[PDB]
Design an enzyme around this catalytic site. Structure first.
Site, PDB file in Angstrom:
ATOM      1  CG  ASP B  33      -2.198   0.307   1.183  1.00  0.00           C
ATOM      2  OD1 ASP B  33      -2.812   1.556  -0.101  1.00  0.00           O
ATOM      3  OD2 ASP B  33      -3.055  -0.136   1.790  1.00  0.00           O
ATOM      4  CE1 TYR B  50       3.493   4.156  -8.310  1.00  0.00           C
ATOM      5  CE2 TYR B  50       1.956   2.650  -9.658  1.00  0.00           C
ATOM      6  CZ  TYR B  50       1.840   3.830  -8.587  1.00  0.00           C
ATOM      7  OH  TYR B  50       1.405   3.149  -7.510  1.00  0.00           O
TER       8      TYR B  50
HETATM    9 MG   LIG Z   1      -3.045  -2.414   3.839  1.00  0.00          MG
HETATM   10 MG   LIG Z   2      -4.712   0.901   5.844  1.00  0.00          MG
END
Ligand SMILES: [Mg+2]
Ligand SMILES: [Mg+2]
Ligand SMILES: [Mg+2]
Ligand SMILES: [Mg+2]
Lengths: 286, 283
Positions: B33, B50
């Protein structure tokens, strides 16, 4: 709705409920945890009635959540047993809680594998029967929904069987909406938040979890929960979890980017969830 | 079996991998993330690619996870054309393929991608690539890597799978059979989930449990260091299920007033309640 935490906290209850009914949370999962530690610290385990002590706090908190505008509260109650069964029974037989259901117009439902997992005894059978009767007697209530989880952790096999029967009598598979209703008794939206305790972990709200479920972990046992604490959690969910405008690094000050970058590179091992143990008790570092 | 955190951090990797293989985590969920935030801070958006930049870091982390003893890693990758370019690299890029082979990783894909991906060529290609990659690494049996694509909610998937199963068996499937069906192979419940920023979890249907250790890093996934990973493992292995379990029933009166004041003085300390600074949420 430009509002500051302090302001949100100073707002009158009925104004919070109003915001909550407009921005959510619509569905909150809140297992009352750490009750054993709580009892030993805030009560006198020598004389006090554990069952009643707990019941009282459960009512206080459930009332607080509902008066703040939360429509559905999901509460896992069971994830020795004689007393575990006596506690469950109180949720359907205690006069104070029954008055609470009536006064706040709460429809009480139960979910989980309890019909099978509860002891096949007189005590076990009564609890199961009590559950069914409560859902029926509070069915006229439409202001709030309360779902108690008893062995409500692994819905896979329950969904498989429900689905097979459904298709048999309908000639087609049930939609996600129908599956949720089949397991909880009534359709319920995905949890908007889950308020945990101590060690970071969540449980018992099968089929209702999503990347959008805001997760919180109190340091103190659930029964220490006060209105101020709930409002701080609510404010974070409503105004901070999806703060707008969304970040656009592409247009952030070079100075702000640099501090941000330095922060991450200096503390690459700063992880919430990593705690330390003191006298056997786990404490989140932060 | 009595190791402080400082000691654990100083152990040779081989010793750590032997502890993990014995005490878990066996199944770890780790979505990468905050990569766009990471890209903007650690790369030159003007000239660095990227996709590539991200793939390199992904390989770097998976390598770390698998060398530390973790058998299965579940990694949600998606839930748009560039989204496919990233997927494509997972089953086509020369270096990641060498990775699956070098570390003997069997790659599987889960989720509703076969029905959600664009009904085009590029999309049909991805699907075939996924199916072929699972086949081409089926001889590897040292580690498992499950990539989640549209793997957020298995409700209808399980229903249809169960109805078909009852038709082909005359019986409803067991939990084990349902898991095997959704993930392709049976996978145990997740022992830990490593998150980022705002406390939330996602994309590992049917495998969450109250015993799944949850963590949330402050900085984007790609800033993870060996030290960070070891601190998570240490907490999981030695602290999350520490023993002896608390005995308030026999604690000192002095200690009781300590826990007591802590909880009464700071009634509203809640991890997960944060603040937003310059549009960024911090715990
Ligand atoms: Mg996460
Ligand atoms: Mg989160
Ligand atoms: Mg909890
Ligand atoms: Mg916990």
């Amino acid at each position: 709705n430009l509002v500051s935490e302090k302001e949100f906290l100073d707002l009158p209850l009925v104004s919070v409920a109003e915001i909550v009914r407009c921005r959510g949370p619509k569905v909150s999962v809140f297992p009352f945890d750490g009750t054993r530690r709580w009892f030993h610290l805030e009560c006198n385990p020598q004389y006090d009635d554990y069952q009643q002590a707990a019941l009282r706090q459960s009512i206080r908190i459930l009332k607080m959540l509902f008066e703040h505008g939360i429509e559905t509260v999901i509460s896992p109650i069971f994830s020795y047993i004689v007393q575990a069964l006596e506690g469950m029974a109180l949720l359907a037989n205690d006069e104070e809680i029954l008055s609470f259901y009536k006064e706040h117009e709460v429809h009480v439902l139960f979910y989980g594998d309890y019909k099978k997992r509860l002891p096949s005894t007189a005590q076990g059978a009564a609890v199961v029967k009590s559950f069914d009767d409560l859902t029926i007697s509070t069915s006229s209530n439409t202001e709030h929904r309360l779902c108690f989880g008893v062995f409500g952790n692994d819905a896979a096999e329950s969904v498989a069987q429900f689905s097979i029967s459904w298709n048999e009598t309908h000639g087609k598979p049930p939609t996600r909406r129908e599956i949720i209703e089949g397991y909880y008794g009534e359709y319920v939206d995905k949890a908007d938040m889950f308020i945990g305790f101590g060690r970071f972990s969540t449980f018992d709200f099968p089929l209702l979890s999503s990347g959008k479920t805001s997760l919180y972990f109190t340091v103190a046992p659930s029964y220490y929960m006060t209105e101020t604490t709930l409002r701080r959690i609510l404010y974070d969910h409503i105004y901070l979890r999806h703060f707008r405008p969304k970040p656009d690094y592409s247009a952030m000050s070079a100075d702000q980017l640099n501090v941000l970058r330095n922060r991450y590179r200096a503390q690459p091992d700063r992880v919430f969830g990593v705690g330390c143990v003191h006298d056997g008790i786990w404490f989140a570092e932060g």
